[PDB]
Amino acid sequence: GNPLVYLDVDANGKPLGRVVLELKADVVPKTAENFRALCTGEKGFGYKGSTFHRVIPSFMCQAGDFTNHNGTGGKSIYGSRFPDENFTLKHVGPGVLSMANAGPNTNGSQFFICTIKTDWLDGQHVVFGHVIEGMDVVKKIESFGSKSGRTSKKIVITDCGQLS
Ligand SMILES: CCn1nnc(NC(=O)c2cccs2)n1
Numbered sequence: 571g572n573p574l575v576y577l578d579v580d581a582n583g584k585p586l587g588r589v590v591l592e593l594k595a596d597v598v599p600k601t602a603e604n605f606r607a608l609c610t611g612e613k614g615f616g617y618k619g620s621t622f623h624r625v626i627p628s629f630m631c632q633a634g635d636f637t638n639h640n641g642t643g644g645k646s647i648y649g650s651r652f653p654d655e656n657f658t659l660k661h662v663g664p665g666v667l668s669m670a671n672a673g674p675n676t677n678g679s680q681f682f683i684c685t686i687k688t689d690w691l692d693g694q695h696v697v698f699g700h701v702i703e704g705m706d707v708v709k710k711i712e713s714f715g716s717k718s719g720r721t722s723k724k725i726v727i728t729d730c731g732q733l734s
Contacts, residue, residue: 572596574733575609577617579707581714581723589683589704590733591667594697598655600648601669601677601698607647608634608679609730615645617679622725625715630688631708632670632719633727634680641670644679651676659697661688665708667699685712 573593579586595602608616620636637643646652653675661668661684668691670680677696685708701708714723 571734573602573606574702575606576731576733577609577727578729579622579711580726580728581710583726585728586710587704587707589707590702591699592702593667593699594659597658598696598698600652601655601696604646604648604652604677604679605667605681605698606732610732611730613647617727617730620727622711622721622727624719625711625721625725626717626719627712627715628686630682630684630686631711631715632680632682633725634670634678636679641680646678651678653677654696657693657696660692661690661695661697663687665701665705666697667701669696669698671695683708685709 572595575591577589593602607613621639622631622633623641624632635641635643664685666684669677670682714721
């Protein structure tokens with residue numbers, strides 16, 4: 571079945587709880603597999619220890635730059651970047667999980683979790699999952715963001731992995 575994965579998130583070293591995500595491998599298998607493997611670390615690199623570097627309330631929480639920690643970096647399990655798989659899934663509401671990019675065919679490791687319907691991103695960012703449990707933890711993360719995206723506490727993925 572579709573992978574079920576988790577992110578355990580801290581703020582300034584204090585646990586906020588766990589976000590559980592379903593990865594829709596039945597629709598975007600290549601994109602789902604990249605995220606799954608970056609959660610387990612099985613390729614020797616991944617999300618463990620990296621940050622939510624940009625968090626904008628009433629928009630989205632962005633993470634996954636485990637190379638430069640500022641939105642300029644990241645890499646996929648396939649190479650530096652990989653193509654846009656498809657745009658079949660849409661940004662339907664809060665809790666959508668989607669890939670960040672710098673234009674067409676620039677997916678790496680950066681991703682975002684929506685806190686509102688971001689339908690204006692449809693057809694430009696590859697959606698690949700959604701929050702199963704822990705939207706309250708996502709709201710905690712959101713509360714440490716700002717309109718510029720700068721966070722008022724250091725938000726870290728303390729641990730991550732796969733549940734099924
Ligand atoms: C919706 C969150 N998000 N997803 N992808 C992005 N990328 C950017 O904003 C930029 C990339 C390069 C210069 S700006 N943001």
